[PDB]
Design a protein around this ligand. Structure first.
Ligand SMILES: *[C@@H]1O[C@H](CO)[C@@H](O[C@@H]2O[C@H](CO)[C@@H](O)[C@H](O)[C@H]2NC(C)=O)[C@H](O)[C@H]1NC(C)=O
Ligand SMILES: *[C@@H]1O[C@H](CO)[C@@H](O[C@@H]2O[C@H](CO)[C@@H](O)[C@H](O)[C@H]2NC(C)=O)[C@H](O)[C@H]1NC(C)=O
Ligand SMILES: *[C@@H]1O[C@H](CO)[C@@H](O)[C@H](O)[C@H]1NC(C)=O
Ligand SMILES: *[C@@H]1O[C@H](CO)[C@@H](O)[C@H](O)[C@H]1NC(C)=O
Ligand SMILES: *[C@@H]1O[C@H](CO)[C@@H](O)[C@H](O)[C@H]1NC(C)=O
Ligand SMILES: *[C@@H]1O[C@H](CO)[C@@H](O)[C@H](O)[C@H]1NC(C)=O
Ligand SMILES: *[C@@H]1O[C@H](CO)[C@@H](O)[C@H](O)[C@H]1NC(C)=O
Ligand SMILES: *[C@@H]1O[C@H](CO)[C@@H](O)[C@H](O)[C@H]1NC(C)=O
Ligand SMILES: *[C@@H]1O[C@H](CO)[C@@H](O)[C@H](O)[C@H]1NC(C)=O
Lengths: 208, 346, 369, 50, 198
């Protein structure tokens, strides 16, 4: 697995709550992704990737090499482990807490020149998944613009996750989430069209 | 920073400098007179149709009576300021239909009857250059009752109990006072401010002004066309400056914006918890029982009462400042317009 | 209002008029299932506090008022809500956590405390909402020879996160020698067993603790209590109860483009501007009912007893909260004074260029410019 | 104090308008000094004869 | 070891911003106004500066106040001696008496005293158990500590609001005095005044 480093280019915002607002500038402190961050590109033709308060995931492989994810402290046993393995025929979010099963959950919607921008969050025993698909031209690097992410699935796990691993030729971008305050601009229809990172530069500090 | 261009006047004990020509300069002075008159409903602002909140609010005495009295005093004082500034003429004079004043051209500061409102060219530019909002005047609840997705800020300001009152003197009446003062000044000089108006030709009136400032009247009478040309060019320069530059009316823009920011802050203070568990009174009354609910409602009542008292204190200070500026404007009207002033830089 | 018996000539703003609600509507989702609180509060045994079970409860008609008939407990100790107000409002999801501790540590089941249970067995968050139930079990979980089926963890490297478990049994490293799975010097087992006996004091007796954790209404409501629904009404000032959200207003159709994951719509000053109906998937607006201000215009009480009423800021095809005179002004409109086509000096100011006065030539209150 | 800051964030926008009032006073003082002293357009000088 | 009040004012978050115009620039403006009103009459206040002898400028001032200029031109040495004696007398009066600048001394003293009172207000308990915040954080648990913290926040916020309101009223009074001083600079210095006791 080769590892390259690239730029985020102000991508990866999401709706912070399930309420509606129109033409109102609103400030939110949450687990966000900083603008112009050092997002890490992986090409797989393989250690466990570190987990630190939510992971942003992007991919361009349309033939579904990246199937699922395996979480936990260790790999197989001796701790509390997770298994969110998915396939392509039917979309299943089958979650196992075998390591002695204590949490099982299945539901349909996880998956539906395309960006599958995902955000995984683990706060206070609550696991939240944000997902958004986006068309792209000039598929190298990351596009410039704004495309918000929407809430998909919540789960009551109730463990630690400190390591995560994708399930596999493939190329994907992994970005790391930090607690951060954003200033989001709601449109007339309720669409997030613009956002200001409140701790990026003094001009954005003045804007906030 | 630079204090200015350095100069060194050549002074000796037997040398003098005497002017040989002159210029006529027209300058613009802008003064605020009155501001937005507001009224605040305490029960609608704090409680909003809640009998438990009203019964908790009734134990705090008479804060809201003196708040309403202070806001009523400010609202009366604004109309008093406008009446004191403008209502200084006893009869509404009108210009005769002949429009010759010795070469001077007042066609573009005098009103024209073509427009529905009798406002002149410079008055229309000044009324358009200031972005004065509608401020909930023409039936704001009827406007907010419509099915429009663009929810106005004035809709929330009206719904939270904050009402904006209309002034006693409308813009048509203010323009009628301005037209009466202009016609009286042009047709009679200073004689209409000290009794009945006495007619006088405008060239001889300007000769009286020249003799007042200390220049003999033959200087005017041998330079009348030049002085008329300079005055017309100066008035055209004022119109070009007011058409191009939009930053001259910053005082009136600040007068609008301070009231807008104060009402916006008073609306936005309703979303704070103030140490309670929720900022929604019905949510508190639904979640909690009587005693603990009364505790949280008392905390919210204290916070909203503090916000209202801060708003009333800032309104009183701004009303004092606006009253001082209106008194200065009334003195400037009575001295500059109704007569001739020997005071330097006044 | 003036707290006097004599009123001089002028205008006085007095109170606020507001149209009253007529009926009340309650909207709840159609749920008929009954979730089993009975199987949570009746069990042969409860799990240990290091291995506490967690039961997720949704799609239920949660009858809370019957919970006092299943277990003999004193205080239904709630932290976020009221114990007697659980049958009206409703939630998203319920979580039930059941375990057994000793009587010294039952005070430790509280948001934001430091000890042994709250640090290494069961930690509650600082923003915790829900209720805690505790009852004595000396006749069920105590043995004369010693009941050792209940264990708890007292050694750990770090304090527990809120709402998480740690059931791994590894030998504690209390020093520098490696344990290698063998207990002895500076190597202690993390689980220590309770030693419950019926002859102990009241503080050492075993207590059964059941914690109900609630989630606030931000998601679509899955569990709601036994409140009957009411047919929907529109275009009238009504008291509405939408999934526990109580308000007063008038409902209209909304053209707002709500997303499928959004249930509420918010204003600037935190007011519910729009709501999604739980039964049918429809978006409704909330507008507050008609209000304003009332001003009384009068001469002195030594002159006459006739008054006029100005309604501020309202169009007045809607007056109901002499009486044959209505004149439309800019500052609301006027009832009780007639408009004349004359012009005098302003006696009592009203609004944009309109004044009122008392005239003799029958005496009456007239309004002019 | 992080806890005191967290309970200070719930009291609204009192401190923003306090800062706005103090900034208005600080601007107004220099406006007063400018409008009192800076009234001459140029800087004059006395000739060396006295 | 001697801690000043300014050190505690800075350490408790009350700072003082410097003015935009320094004393050198204020003195340069004053010197420019003096040079204009000595070497050019009043004409610099009505356009370009026009030079004029000082004896003739005194003659114009005498003719303005209503005395014929021969009274000046026959008593020039006496008037110059009287003016020099009056200048020396006001110099000696400012050298001796120190109770004349009480207005500016009060302007300094009010803004010293308000910050001293604001710093002194931090030592109060406001119904809590300790005025020190870290004592409450070290001693009490979360809920009761939040109660005492809420009492301290409410007391200190009320004190800060009182200070801001007093500063706003004093700013209004200072602005009125500055407007009067600007009018006096426009009318006395740049011209000749016909107003009695102005
Ligand atoms: C005084 O100034 C005016 C304008 O500043 C002079 O009028 C100008 O005269 C020249 C030549 O006579 C013309 O080309 C200009 O068009 C005139 N200007 C205007 C506005 O009419 C006037 O000549 C000056 N007087 C003296 C004695 O120099
Ligand atoms: C008095 O002023 C008016 C208004 O500026 C002059 O009218 C302008 O005349 C010019 C030249 O004919 C036109 O280009 C403008 O369109 C006119 N403006 C308006 C508003 O009518 C007028 O010429 C001036 N002189 C007089 C009346 O002698
Ligand atoms: C990301 O970090 C690496 C560290 O070696 C650096 O080389 C690279 O330039 C960074 N990317 C940026 C700043 O976009
Ligand atoms: C997860 O377990 C590790 C043990 O190596 C521990 O350091 C960490 O604190 C645990 N996670 C959390 C969120 O406390
Ligand atoms: C909102 O949506 C409508 C139709 O869906 C569209 O016509 C309008 O332009 C949108 N508003 C924006 C993009 O600001
Ligand atoms: C007048 O000015 C000249 C040149 O500066 C000087 O020499 C002369 O002494 C002055 N007159 C008097 C009386 O001082
Ligand atoms: C609840 O009501 C809706 C609308 O009437 C209906 O579509 C749905 O099937 C109902 N649910 C049940 C369980 O009856
Ligand atoms: C508790 O519930 C079970 C359910 O089968 C029942 O058999 C048992 O009798 C109940 N306990 C009591 C004390 O009634
Ligand atoms: C509101 O008032 C205006 C002015 O009288 C009137 O023309 C309009 O019809 C009114 N609106 C109604 C009755 O809906």
């Amino acid at each position: 697995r080769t590892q390259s480093y690239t730029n985020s280019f102000t991508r990866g915002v999401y709706y912070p709550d399930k309420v509606f607002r129109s033409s109102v500038l609103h400030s939110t402190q949450d687990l966000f992704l900083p603008f112009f961050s050092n997002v890490t590109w992986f090409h797989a033709i393989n250690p466990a990737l570190p987990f630190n308060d939510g992971v942003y995931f992007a991919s361009t492989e349309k033939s579904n090499i990246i199937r699922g994810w395996i979480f936990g402290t260790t790999l197989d046993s001796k701790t509390q482990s997770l298994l969110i393995v998915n396939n392509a025929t039917n979309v299943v979010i089958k979650v196992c807490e075998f390591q002695n099963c204590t949490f099982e959950y299945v539901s349909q919607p996880f998956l539906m020149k395309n960006l599958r921008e995902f955000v995984f969050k683990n706060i206070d025993g609550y696991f939240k998944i944000y997902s958004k698909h986006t068309p792209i031209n000039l598929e190298r690097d990351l596009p410039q613009g704004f495309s918000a992410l929407e809430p998909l699935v919540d789960l009551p796990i109730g463990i630690n996750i400190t390591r995560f691993q994708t399930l596999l030729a493939a190329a994907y971008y992994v970005g790391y989430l930090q607690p951060r305050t954003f200033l989001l601009k709601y449109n007339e229809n309720g669409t997030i069209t613009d956002a200001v990172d409140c701790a990026l530069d003094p001009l954005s500090e003045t804007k906030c | 920073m630079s204090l200015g261009a350095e100069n060194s006047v050549a002074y000796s004990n037997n040398s003098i400098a005497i002017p040989t020509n002159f210029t006529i300069s027209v300058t613009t002075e802008i003064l605020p007179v009155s501001m937005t008159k507001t009224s605040v409903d305490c029960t609608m602002y704090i409680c909003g149709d809640s009998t438990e909140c009203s019964n908790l609010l009734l134990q705090y005495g008479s804060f809201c009576t003196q708040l309403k009295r202070a806001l009523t005093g400010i609202a009366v004082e604004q109309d008093k300021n406008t009446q004191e500034v403008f209502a200084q003429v006893k009869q509404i004079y009108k210009t005769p239909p002949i429009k010759y004043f010795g070469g001077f051209n007042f066609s573009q500061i005098l009103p024209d009857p073509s427009k529905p409102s009798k406002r002149s060219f410079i008055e229309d530019l000044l009324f358009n250059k200031v972005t004065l909002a509608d401020a909930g005047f023409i039936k704001q609840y009827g406007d907010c009752l419509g099915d429009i997705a663009a929810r106005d800020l004035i809709c929330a300001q009206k719904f939270n109990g904050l009402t904006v009152l209309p002034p006693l003197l409308t813009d048509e009446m203010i323009a009628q006072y301005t037209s009466a003062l202009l016609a009286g000044t042009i047709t009679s000089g200073w004689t209409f401010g000290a009794g009945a108006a006495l007619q006088i030709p405008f060239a001889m009136q300007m000769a009286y002004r020249f003799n007042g400032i200390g220049v003999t009247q033959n200087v005017l009478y041998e330079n009348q066309k030049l002085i008329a040309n300079q005055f017309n060019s100066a008035i055209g320069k004022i119109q070009d400056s007011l058409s191009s530059t939009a930053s001259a009316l910053g005082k009136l823009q600040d007068v609008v914006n301070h009231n807008a920011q104060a009402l916006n802050t008073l609306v936005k203070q309703l979303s704070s918890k103030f140490g309670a568990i929720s900022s929604v009174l019905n949510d508190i009354l639904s979640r909690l029982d009587k005693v603990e609910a009364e505790v949280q409602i008392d905390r919210l009542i204290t916070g909203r009462l503090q916000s209202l008292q801060t708003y009333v204190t800032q309104q009183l200070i701004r009303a004092a400042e606006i009253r001082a500026s209106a008194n200065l404007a009334a003195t400037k009207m009575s001295e500059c317009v109704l007569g001739q002033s020997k005071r330097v830089d006044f | 209002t003036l707290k006097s018996f004599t009123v001089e000539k002028g205008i006085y703003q007095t109170s606020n008029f507001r149209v009253q609600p007529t009926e009340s509507i309650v909207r709840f989702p159609n749920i008929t299932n009954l979730c089993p609180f009975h199987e949570v509060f009746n069990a042969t045994t409860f799990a240990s506090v290091y291995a506490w079970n967690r039961k997720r409860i949704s799609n239920c008609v949660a009858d809370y008022s019957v919970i006092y008939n299943f277990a003999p407990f004193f205080a239904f100790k709630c932290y976020g809500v009221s114990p007697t107000k659980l049958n009206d409002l409703c939630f998203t999801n319920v979580y039930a956590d059941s375990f057994v501790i000793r009587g010294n540590e039952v005070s430790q089941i509280a948001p934001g405390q430091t000890g042994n249970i709250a640090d290494y067995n069961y930690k509650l968050p600082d923003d915790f909402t829900g209720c805690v139930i505790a009852w004595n079990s000396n006749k069920l979980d105590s043995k004369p020879s010693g009941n050792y089926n209940y264990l708890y963890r007292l050694f750990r490297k770090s304090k527990l996160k809120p709402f998480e478990r740690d059931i791994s049994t590894e030998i504690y490293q209390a020093g520098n020698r490696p344990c290698n799975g063998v207990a002895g010097p500076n190597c202690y087992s993390p689980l220590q067993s309770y030693g419950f006996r019926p002859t102990y004091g009241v503080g050492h007796q075993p207590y059964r603790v059941v914690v109900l954790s609630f989630e606030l209404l931000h998601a679509p409501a899955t569990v709601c209590g036994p409140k009957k629904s009411t047919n929907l009404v529109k275009n009238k000032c009504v008291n509405f109860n939408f999934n526990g959200l109580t308000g007063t207003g008038v409902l209209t159709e909304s053209n707002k483009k709500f997303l499928p994951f959004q249930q509420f719509g918010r204003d600037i000053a935190d007011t519910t501007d729009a709501v999604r109906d739980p039964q049918t998937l429809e978006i409704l607006d909330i507008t507050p009912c008609s209000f304003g201000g009332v001003s009384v215009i009068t001469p002195g009480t030594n002159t006459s007893n006739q008054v006029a009423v100005l309604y501020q800021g309202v169009n007045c095809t809607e007056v109901p909260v002499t009486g044959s005179n209505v004149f439309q002004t800019r500052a609301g409109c006027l009832i009780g004074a007639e408009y004349v086509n004359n012009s005098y000096e302003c006696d009592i100011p009203i609004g944009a260029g309109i004044c009122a006065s008392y005239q003799t030539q029958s005496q009456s209150i007239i309004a002019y410019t």
